[PDB]
Amino acid sequence: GSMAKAAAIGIDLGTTYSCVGVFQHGKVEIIANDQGNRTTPSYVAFTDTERLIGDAAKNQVALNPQNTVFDAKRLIGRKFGDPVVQSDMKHWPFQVINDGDKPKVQVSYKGETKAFYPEEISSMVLTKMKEIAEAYLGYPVTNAVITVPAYFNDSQRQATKDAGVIAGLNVLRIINEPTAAAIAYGLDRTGKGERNVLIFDLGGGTFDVSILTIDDGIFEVKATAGDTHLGGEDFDNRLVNHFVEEFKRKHKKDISQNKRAVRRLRTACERAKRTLSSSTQASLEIDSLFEGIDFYTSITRARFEELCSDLFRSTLEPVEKALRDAKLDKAQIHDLVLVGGSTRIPKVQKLLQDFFNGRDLNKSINPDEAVAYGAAVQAAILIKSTRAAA
Ligand SMILES: Nc1ncnc2c1nc(Br)n2[C@@H]1O[C@H](CO)[C@@H](O)[C@H]1O
Ligand SMILES: [Mg+2]
């Protein structure tokens, strides 16, 4: 009669990391890639012989900086002349060129110089998320919901859809990241009456706060605020500067000019930063860091909290601005939702909870997975084709 339908997937197409989920048997499964990772770097690398996507691209970035593309989401649907684009280009080791006032990334690939639109790079990331899902399901996937930031305009939303079409996906819907995070907690299934939800999204490079109103499952974005210069990478930089100074004191050597030693230090710092979210201290153990000197040291959670204290406190300014813009008081917020791996930082949680006079925070769904979780829930709802009974 009628063949069973393939499951639809939910993709969080992130600036730095992407995540894929599927809703089956009344629950969401976040799908790990072939290296066992639940999130995949939004990186595409080009060589003379291969195109690498995800973890394989990110793991060779150090020796191939000019031909490894990341941050395509900061370029999607924007004009080359845009002041956001011009400022960002100074931080990127890859070439961004102007083609009819549209940015394109230019790389060496398979013996030739090739330029790609940002939607073409994003389609390569979406192709990898589709293959991750098909490896788990064991059949081809066609249907997907893809999420975007709430501040994305029509051009940025259309370019995201275009990336989906290039990847061979049927895009069911483009949904806002804060809406997907609310759906993950079922905040649209609480019945009649207005609820005010604050989403606190602290990423690798940016911070976004959104205030949504939910009435009978209908979402309205009331206010958005944030800091484009605040994220996980800034906390990593604070530890890097700290250990560079520590090496100077202990061995009387300045390492800041050996890129390999700095990179090994930064890699070790990001891991120590993660350990400090569950432990009160963390060890740093690098062999032959500089001039055959081994760097074996430690950092307490209290010292790390001191090093990033101004940065953590600055997350409350966009919160107060969003609340003023929404014309609401903090007591009027019904639910608080955490999004992004950097929200696992206990001090970040403590500051926000204290700001909302001890209120519980929704953090039960892994914050780096909540957006894809909500997108998978929506995708399963959008493919239902039930016919009314008599
Ligand atoms: N447990 C964690 N504690 C502290 N930080 C974390 C954690 N997990 C993740 Br993931 N991060 C950081 O989140 C950002 C995601 O783009 C990166 O800067 C990661 O370092
Ligand atoms: Mg995100």
Short mmCIF file of C-alpha atoms and ligand atoms in Angstrom, two decimals:
data_model
loop_
_atom_site.label_atom_id
_atom_site.label_comp_id
_atom_site.label_asym_id
_atom_site.label_seq_id
_atom_site.Cartn_x
_atom_site.Cartn_y
_atom_site.Cartn_z
CA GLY A 1 0.00 0.00 0.00
CA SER A 2 2.29 2.74 1.35
CA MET A 3 6.06 2.22 1.96
CA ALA A 4 7.54 3.52 5.24
CA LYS A 5 9.02 6.99 4.97
CA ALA A 6 12.65 7.76 5.71
CA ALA A 7 13.22 9.83 8.87
CA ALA A 8 13.83 13.60 8.41
CA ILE A 9 16.89 15.14 10.13
CA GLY A 10 17.57 18.35 12.05
CA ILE A 11 20.87 20.16 11.31
CA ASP A 12 22.45 22.90 13.43
CA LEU A 13 24.76 24.50 10.79
CA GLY A 14 27.07 26.36 13.12
CA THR A 15 29.82 28.92 12.55
CA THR A 16 32.51 26.70 14.13
CA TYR A 17 30.72 23.31 14.75
CA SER A 18 27.70 21.58 13.20
CA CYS A 19 25.43 18.91 14.82
CA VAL A 20 22.81 16.47 13.38
CA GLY A 21 19.86 14.75 15.09
CA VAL A 22 16.87 12.54 14.25
CA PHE A 23 13.59 12.08 16.17
CA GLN A 24 12.60 8.37 16.29
CA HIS A 25 10.74 6.13 18.85
CA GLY A 26 9.46 9.24 20.73
CA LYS A 27 13.02 10.61 21.31
CA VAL A 28 15.91 12.54 19.68
CA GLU A 29 19.20 10.82 18.88
CA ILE A 30 22.14 13.20 18.28
CA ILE A 31 24.27 11.31 15.74
CA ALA A 32 28.05 10.91 16.32
CA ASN A 33 30.31 11.02 13.22
CA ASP A 34 32.84 8.20 12.27
CA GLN A 35 35.43 9.49 14.78
CA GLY A 36 32.83 9.24 17.62
CA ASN A 37 32.19 13.00 17.85
CA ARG A 38 28.64 14.36 18.50
CA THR A 39 29.57 17.69 16.88
CA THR A 40 31.61 18.12 13.64
CA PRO A 41 33.87 21.15 12.86
CA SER A 42 32.42 23.40 10.07
CA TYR A 43 35.82 23.18 8.21
CA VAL A 44 36.61 22.28 4.59
CA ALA A 45 40.25 21.70 3.50
CA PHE A 46 41.66 21.46 -0.06
CA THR A 47 44.85 19.66 -1.20
CA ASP A 48 46.29 18.39 -4.54
CA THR A 49 44.56 14.98 -4.04
CA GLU A 50 41.54 15.42 -1.70
CA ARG A 51 38.82 17.61 -0.26
CA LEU A 52 38.51 16.94 3.53
CA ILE A 53 35.46 17.95 5.61
CA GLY A 54 34.98 18.14 9.40
CA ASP A 55 37.50 16.60 11.85
CA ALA A 56 39.87 15.58 8.97
CA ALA A 57 39.97 19.25 7.81
CA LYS A 58 40.43 20.72 11.31
CA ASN A 59 43.24 18.22 12.21
CA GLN A 60 45.56 19.40 9.31
CA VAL A 61 44.81 23.19 9.59
CA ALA A 62 48.27 24.03 11.15
CA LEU A 63 50.30 23.15 8.07
CA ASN A 64 47.59 24.06 5.47
CA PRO A 65 46.21 27.47 6.73
CA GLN A 66 45.71 29.06 3.25
CA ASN A 67 43.60 26.16 1.84
CA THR A 68 41.46 25.31 4.94
CA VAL A 69 38.18 27.25 5.05
CA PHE A 70 36.19 27.89 8.26
CA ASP A 71 33.65 30.65 9.33
CA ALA A 72 31.72 30.57 5.94
CA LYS A 73 28.60 31.41 7.98
CA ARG A 74 30.08 34.90 8.63
CA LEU A 75 30.14 35.44 4.82
CA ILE A 76 26.85 33.78 3.72
CA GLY A 77 24.35 36.19 2.07
CA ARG A 78 26.55 39.27 2.70
CA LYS A 79 28.10 41.77 0.18
CA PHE A 80 31.93 41.99 -0.21
CA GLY A 81 31.89 45.69 0.76
CA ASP A 82 29.92 45.07 4.05
CA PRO A 83 32.00 46.44 7.04
CA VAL A 84 31.50 43.11 8.93
CA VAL A 85 33.18 41.19 6.00
CA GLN A 86 36.12 43.67 5.62
CA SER A 87 36.99 43.48 9.36
CA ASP A 88 36.74 39.62 9.48
CA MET A 89 39.07 39.16 6.42
CA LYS A 90 42.03 40.52 8.49
CA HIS A 91 41.71 37.53 10.90
CA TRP A 92 41.48 34.79 8.18
CA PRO A 93 44.54 33.09 6.62
CA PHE A 94 42.53 32.05 3.51
CA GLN A 95 41.87 34.46 0.59
CA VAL A 96 38.46 36.14 0.24
CA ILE A 97 37.98 37.78 -3.21
CA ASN A 98 35.39 40.15 -4.72
CA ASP A 99 33.15 38.74 -7.53
CA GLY A 100 30.44 41.32 -8.43
CA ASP A 101 30.43 42.67 -4.78
CA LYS A 102 29.89 39.06 -3.52
CA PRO A 103 32.62 37.39 -1.42
CA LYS A 104 34.20 34.13 -2.64
CA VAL A 105 36.95 32.06 -0.97
CA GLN A 106 39.90 31.27 -3.21
CA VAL A 107 42.07 28.14 -2.68
CA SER A 108 44.54 25.74 -4.39
CA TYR A 109 42.67 22.52 -5.12
CA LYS A 110 43.72 19.53 -7.29
CA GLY A 111 46.37 21.52 -9.21
CA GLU A 112 44.19 24.61 -9.89
CA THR A 113 43.17 27.93 -8.23
CA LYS A 114 39.44 27.55 -7.42
CA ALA A 115 37.03 30.14 -5.95
CA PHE A 116 33.84 29.11 -4.10
CA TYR A 117 30.74 31.05 -2.93
CA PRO A 118 30.08 30.77 0.87
CA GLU A 119 26.91 28.67 0.08
CA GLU A 120 29.08 26.18 -1.82
CA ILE A 121 31.39 25.76 1.28
CA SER A 122 28.26 25.38 3.55
CA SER A 123 26.83 22.75 1.10
CA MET A 124 30.07 20.70 1.64
CA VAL A 125 29.46 20.87 5.42
CA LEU A 126 25.77 19.86 4.88
CA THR A 127 26.86 16.92 2.62
CA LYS A 128 29.00 15.59 5.57
CA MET A 129 26.05 15.98 8.07
CA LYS A 130 23.75 14.07 5.59
CA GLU A 131 26.37 11.19 5.28
CA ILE A 132 26.77 11.05 9.15
CA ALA A 133 22.92 10.56 9.42
CA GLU A 134 22.77 8.00 6.56
CA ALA A 135 25.63 5.98 8.24
CA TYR A 136 23.42 5.67 11.39
CA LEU A 137 20.01 5.16 9.64
CA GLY A 138 21.36 2.79 7.02
CA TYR A 139 19.37 4.39 4.17
CA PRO A 140 19.47 7.66 2.09
CA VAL A 141 18.19 10.86 3.80
CA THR A 142 16.30 13.51 1.72
CA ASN A 143 14.44 15.80 4.21
CA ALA A 144 15.99 18.28 6.70
CA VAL A 145 15.27 21.36 8.86
CA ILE A 146 18.28 23.70 9.00
CA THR A 147 18.67 26.40 11.66
CA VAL A 148 19.96 30.02 11.37
CA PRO A 149 20.61 32.93 13.84
CA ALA A 150 17.42 35.02 14.54
CA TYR A 151 19.19 38.16 13.19
CA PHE A 152 19.61 36.55 9.66
CA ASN A 153 17.88 38.62 6.91
CA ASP A 154 16.08 37.21 3.79
CA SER A 155 19.29 37.08 1.63
CA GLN A 156 21.13 35.13 4.40
CA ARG A 157 18.10 32.74 4.78
CA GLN A 158 17.82 32.17 0.98
CA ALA A 159 21.63 31.47 0.72
CA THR A 160 21.26 28.88 3.55
CA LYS A 161 18.38 27.19 1.54
CA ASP A 162 20.63 27.30 -1.62
CA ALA A 163 23.43 25.49 0.35
CA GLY A 164 20.83 22.80 1.26
CA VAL A 165 19.70 22.36 -2.41
CA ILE A 166 23.39 22.07 -3.58
CA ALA A 167 23.94 19.33 -0.92
CA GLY A 168 20.93 17.36 -2.36
CA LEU A 169 18.70 18.05 0.64
CA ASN A 170 15.05 19.00 0.48
CA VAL A 171 14.92 21.92 2.95
CA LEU A 172 11.64 21.54 4.90
CA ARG A 173 12.14 24.85 6.71
CA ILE A 174 14.76 27.37 7.86
CA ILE A 175 14.16 27.90 11.65
CA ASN A 176 15.68 30.33 14.17
CA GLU A 177 18.38 28.84 16.49
CA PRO A 178 16.67 30.26 19.72
CA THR A 179 13.28 28.84 18.56
CA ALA A 180 14.91 25.38 17.98
CA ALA A 181 16.48 25.53 21.51
CA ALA A 182 12.96 26.31 23.00
CA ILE A 183 11.34 23.46 21.00
CA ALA A 184 14.07 21.07 22.39
CA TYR A 185 12.67 21.68 25.91
CA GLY A 186 9.01 21.45 24.74
CA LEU A 187 8.43 25.09 25.71
CA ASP A 188 5.84 25.32 22.88
CA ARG A 189 3.77 22.38 24.35
CA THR A 190 2.81 23.94 27.73
CA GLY A 191 -0.77 24.84 26.58
CA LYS A 192 -2.68 28.17 26.68
CA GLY A 193 -1.12 31.38 28.08
CA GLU A 194 1.89 33.60 27.25
CA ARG A 195 5.38 32.48 28.38
CA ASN A 196 8.57 34.58 28.14
CA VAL A 197 11.76 32.61 27.36
CA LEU A 198 15.36 33.91 27.42
CA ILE A 199 17.93 31.95 25.37
CA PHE A 200 21.55 32.54 26.46
CA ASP A 201 23.87 31.42 23.61
CA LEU A 202 27.62 31.62 24.30
CA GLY A 203 29.65 30.28 21.34
CA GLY A 204 33.29 29.96 20.28
CA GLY A 205 33.44 33.49 18.87
CA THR A 206 30.12 35.26 19.57
CA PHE A 207 27.50 35.75 22.29
CA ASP A 208 23.73 36.03 21.53
CA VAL A 209 20.77 36.59 23.87
CA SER A 210 17.19 36.29 22.55
CA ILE A 211 13.84 36.90 24.23
CA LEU A 212 10.91 34.91 22.76
CA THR A 213 7.24 34.92 23.60
CA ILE A 214 5.27 31.66 23.22
CA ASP A 215 1.42 31.67 23.10
CA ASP A 216 -0.48 28.49 22.02
CA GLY A 217 2.72 27.16 20.34
CA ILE A 218 3.23 30.46 18.36
CA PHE A 219 6.72 32.03 18.68
CA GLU A 220 7.47 35.77 18.50
CA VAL A 221 11.10 37.11 18.76
CA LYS A 222 10.75 40.09 21.19
CA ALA A 223 14.45 41.16 21.41
CA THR A 224 17.96 40.10 20.39
CA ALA A 225 21.29 41.45 21.81
CA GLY A 226 24.83 40.17 22.11
CA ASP A 227 28.53 40.72 21.74
CA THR A 228 30.30 39.83 18.49
CA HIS A 229 33.67 40.01 20.35
CA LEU A 230 32.92 37.52 23.21
CA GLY A 231 33.29 33.72 23.08
CA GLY A 232 35.17 30.57 24.10
CA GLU A 233 38.27 31.61 22.05
CA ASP A 234 38.73 34.75 24.24
CA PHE A 235 38.88 32.58 27.41
CA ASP A 236 41.53 30.39 25.61
CA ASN A 237 43.54 33.56 24.76
CA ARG A 238 43.53 34.58 28.49
CA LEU A 239 45.07 31.17 29.48
CA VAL A 240 47.61 31.38 26.60
CA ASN A 241 48.88 34.81 27.78
CA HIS A 242 49.01 33.45 31.39
CA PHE A 243 51.17 30.37 30.49
CA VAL A 244 53.47 32.41 28.13
CA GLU A 245 54.20 34.66 31.20
CA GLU A 246 54.64 31.56 33.46
CA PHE A 247 57.26 30.07 31.07
CA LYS A 248 59.06 33.49 31.04
CA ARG A 249 59.19 33.54 34.90
CA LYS A 250 60.23 29.82 35.35
CA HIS A 251 62.70 29.29 32.43
CA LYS A 252 63.56 32.94 31.38
CA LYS A 253 62.48 32.16 27.78
CA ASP A 254 59.88 33.95 25.60
CA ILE A 255 58.07 31.28 23.52
CA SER A 256 55.55 33.66 21.82
CA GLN A 257 57.55 33.62 18.48
CA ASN A 258 57.54 29.79 17.83
CA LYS A 259 54.10 29.22 16.21
CA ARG A 260 54.27 25.44 16.95
CA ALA A 261 54.95 26.01 20.69
CA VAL A 262 52.11 28.63 20.85
CA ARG A 263 49.71 26.25 19.00
CA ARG A 264 50.65 23.29 21.29
CA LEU A 265 50.14 25.65 24.31
CA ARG A 266 46.71 26.93 22.98
CA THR A 267 45.56 23.30 22.19
CA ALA A 268 46.55 22.25 25.76
CA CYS A 269 44.79 25.40 27.19
CA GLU A 270 41.41 24.74 25.44
CA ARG A 271 41.52 21.13 26.90
CA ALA A 272 42.46 22.40 30.43
CA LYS A 273 39.58 24.93 30.07
CA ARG A 274 37.18 21.99 29.39
CA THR A 275 38.55 19.92 32.36
CA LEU A 276 37.98 22.94 34.70
CA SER A 277 34.20 22.79 33.99
CA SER A 278 33.95 19.45 35.93
CA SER A 279 37.18 19.56 38.07
CA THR A 280 38.50 22.19 40.63
CA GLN A 281 42.01 22.02 39.02
CA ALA A 282 43.67 20.76 35.80
CA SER A 283 47.19 19.67 34.79
CA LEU A 284 49.05 21.00 31.73
CA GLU A 285 51.72 18.53 30.49
CA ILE A 286 53.63 19.40 27.27
CA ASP A 287 56.89 17.63 26.35
CA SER A 288 59.71 19.69 24.68
CA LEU A 289 57.58 22.84 24.32
CA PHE A 290 60.55 25.17 23.53
CA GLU A 291 64.34 24.53 23.47
CA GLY A 292 63.83 20.89 24.61
CA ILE A 293 62.20 22.13 27.86
CA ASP A 294 59.18 20.15 29.14
CA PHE A 295 56.29 22.26 30.41
CA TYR A 296 54.50 20.42 33.26
CA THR A 297 52.21 22.76 35.24
CA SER A 298 48.68 23.21 36.70
CA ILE A 299 45.83 25.77 36.94
CA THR A 300 43.07 25.94 39.55
CA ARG A 301 39.48 26.74 38.59
CA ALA A 302 39.76 29.83 40.93
CA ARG A 303 42.79 31.20 38.92
CA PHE A 304 41.08 30.54 35.56
CA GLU A 305 37.89 32.32 36.88
CA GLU A 306 40.11 35.28 37.95
CA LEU A 307 41.82 35.42 34.45
CA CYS A 308 38.43 35.60 32.59
CA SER A 309 36.40 37.47 35.28
CA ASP A 310 35.75 40.67 33.21
CA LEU A 311 34.71 38.59 30.17
CA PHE A 312 32.24 36.41 32.16
CA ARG A 313 30.64 39.53 33.82
CA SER A 314 30.26 41.28 30.44
CA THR A 315 27.67 38.59 29.37
CA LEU A 316 25.09 40.35 31.63
CA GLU A 317 25.16 43.66 29.63
CA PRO A 318 23.39 42.18 26.50
CA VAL A 319 20.95 40.40 28.97
CA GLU A 320 19.92 43.81 30.54
CA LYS A 321 19.79 45.45 27.05
CA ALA A 322 17.52 42.62 25.68
CA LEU A 323 15.23 42.90 28.77
CA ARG A 324 14.91 46.72 28.23
CA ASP A 325 14.25 46.18 24.46
CA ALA A 326 11.58 43.50 25.25
CA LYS A 327 10.09 46.01 27.84
CA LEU A 328 10.25 43.22 30.48
CA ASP A 329 11.57 42.82 34.03
CA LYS A 330 13.77 39.81 35.00
CA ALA A 331 10.97 38.43 37.27
CA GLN A 332 8.73 38.24 34.14
CA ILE A 333 11.02 35.64 32.41
CA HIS A 334 9.43 32.15 32.83
CA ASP A 335 12.31 29.97 31.44
CA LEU A 336 16.10 30.36 30.95
CA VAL A 337 17.78 28.14 28.30
CA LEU A 338 21.57 27.57 27.85
CA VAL A 339 23.09 27.10 24.32
CA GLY A 340 26.78 26.60 23.44
CA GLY A 341 29.62 24.57 25.03
CA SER A 342 30.96 27.68 26.86
CA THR A 343 27.78 27.65 29.02
CA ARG A 344 29.17 24.56 30.84
CA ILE A 345 31.53 27.01 32.67
CA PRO A 346 30.29 26.94 36.34
CA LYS A 347 31.08 30.64 36.93
CA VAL A 348 29.04 31.64 33.81
CA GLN A 349 26.11 29.58 35.20
CA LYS A 350 26.52 31.11 38.69
CA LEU A 351 26.56 34.73 37.39
CA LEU A 352 23.37 34.25 35.34
CA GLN A 353 21.47 32.33 38.07
CA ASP A 354 22.42 35.12 40.61
CA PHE A 355 21.21 37.77 38.07
CA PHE A 356 17.82 35.93 37.94
CA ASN A 357 17.71 35.61 41.80
CA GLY A 358 18.52 31.84 42.03
CA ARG A 359 16.25 30.57 39.22
CA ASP A 360 16.90 27.09 37.72
CA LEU A 361 18.57 27.03 34.28
CA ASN A 362 17.55 24.55 31.54
CA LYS A 363 20.86 22.81 30.81
CA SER A 364 19.78 19.10 30.84
CA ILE A 365 20.07 18.83 27.02
CA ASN A 366 23.81 19.21 26.16
CA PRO A 367 24.11 22.97 25.27
CA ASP A 368 26.20 22.20 22.16
CA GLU A 369 23.35 19.86 21.00
CA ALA A 370 20.06 21.72 21.98
CA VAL A 371 19.64 23.55 18.63
CA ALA A 372 20.00 20.34 16.49
CA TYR A 373 17.72 18.55 19.05
CA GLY A 374 14.90 21.09 18.47
CA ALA A 375 15.49 21.06 14.69
CA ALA A 376 15.07 17.18 14.68
CA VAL A 377 11.80 17.50 16.72
CA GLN A 378 10.47 20.06 14.15
CA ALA A 379 11.59 17.94 11.16
CA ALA A 380 9.53 14.92 12.35
CA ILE A 381 6.43 17.20 12.81
CA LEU A 382 6.83 18.75 9.31
CA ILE A 383 6.78 15.35 7.41
CA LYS A 384 3.55 14.06 9.09
CA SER A 385 0.72 13.57 6.54
CA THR A 386 -2.08 12.12 8.72
CA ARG A 387 -5.63 12.18 7.25
CA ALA A 388 -8.56 13.16 9.52
CA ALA A 389 -10.84 10.42 10.88
CA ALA A 390 -14.68 10.62 10.45
N1 LIG B 1 32.81 21.56 28.90
C1 LIG B 1 33.22 22.72 28.37
N2 LIG B 1 33.66 23.69 29.20
C2 LIG B 1 34.09 24.84 28.68
N3 LIG B 1 34.15 25.20 27.39
C3 LIG B 1 33.69 24.23 26.59
C4 LIG B 1 33.22 22.99 26.99
N4 LIG B 1 32.77 22.25 25.90
C5 LIG B 1 32.97 23.06 24.90
BR1 LIG B 1 32.41 22.66 23.17
N5 LIG B 1 33.54 24.27 25.22
C6 LIG B 1 33.92 25.37 24.35
O1 LIG B 1 32.80 25.78 23.59
C7 LIG B 1 33.25 26.39 22.36
C8 LIG B 1 32.44 25.86 21.20
O2 LIG B 1 32.68 26.58 20.00
C9 LIG B 1 34.77 26.17 22.29
O3 LIG B 1 35.46 27.37 22.61
C10 LIG B 1 35.02 25.07 23.34
O4 LIG B 1 36.29 25.23 23.95
MG MG B 2 25.27 27.61 17.63
#
